[PDB]
Symmetry: C3
Subunit: 84 residues, 3 copies
């Protein structure tokens, strides 16, 4: 289950069936792996009411950091976002 | 044509070219099949100002049900959503 | 870099790694080609606080033109949008 969401805004799904959600009112991005019962919080930092999310074929995750007027990305496995 | 939309928020497109739209102010999700002149309303139920939509490779449709703080999905052909 | 964004809302990424963003408060859609240092503004016209974006396998770009209650698209290479 996704839990503790606040007014979620965006959603994306990768080729593995992992679903990524911008949890807009909690200033975070969460994901739920296919056949997992437990969400994870992606290691973005400093998000402000994030609104949309996409995931490319390499599993890189892209987020419109709505409140900070910027776009950020995280490579799969990475813990350090890049600002586009 | 898409018609009767109210402040649509999200859009997705599948490998068949079917376009899915969250019709935010009408509390519904609509789709337009590639080379169709007529939209369909997907059989989600109880949506509250839905904001984003995605579609996986099996045609499963995922929606951030923004006002209800939850994520919902419908398998292709299914009439019964699942809350994630 | 993406620059001059205002409260960006949606994001999509194509199979080439080109990232497309709805630059919501500037009434436009921007894109950044993979390994490019410079954004481009897509030739949509008349957008009103656009909210979501998607890109199909042929590079056609779809935008929910939120304020105008409509969905618009541009074929790759085209300078003339179509209203869906
Ligand atoms: Cl909100
Ligand atoms: Cl907001
Ligand atoms: Cl609105
Ligand atoms: Cl709302
Ligand atoms: Cl806004
Ligand atoms: Cl708005």
């Amino acid at each position: 289950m996704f839990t503790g969401l606040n007014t979620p805004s965006g959603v994306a799904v990768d080729s593995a069936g992992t679903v990524y959600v911008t949890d807009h009112g909690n200033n975070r991005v969460v994901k739920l792996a296919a056949g997992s019962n437990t969400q994870t919080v992606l290691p973005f930092t400093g998000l402000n009411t994030p609104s949309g999310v996409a995931v490319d074929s390499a599993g890189t995750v892209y987020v419109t950091d709505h409140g900070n007027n910027r776009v950020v990305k995280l490579a799969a496995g990475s813990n350090t976002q890049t600002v586009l």
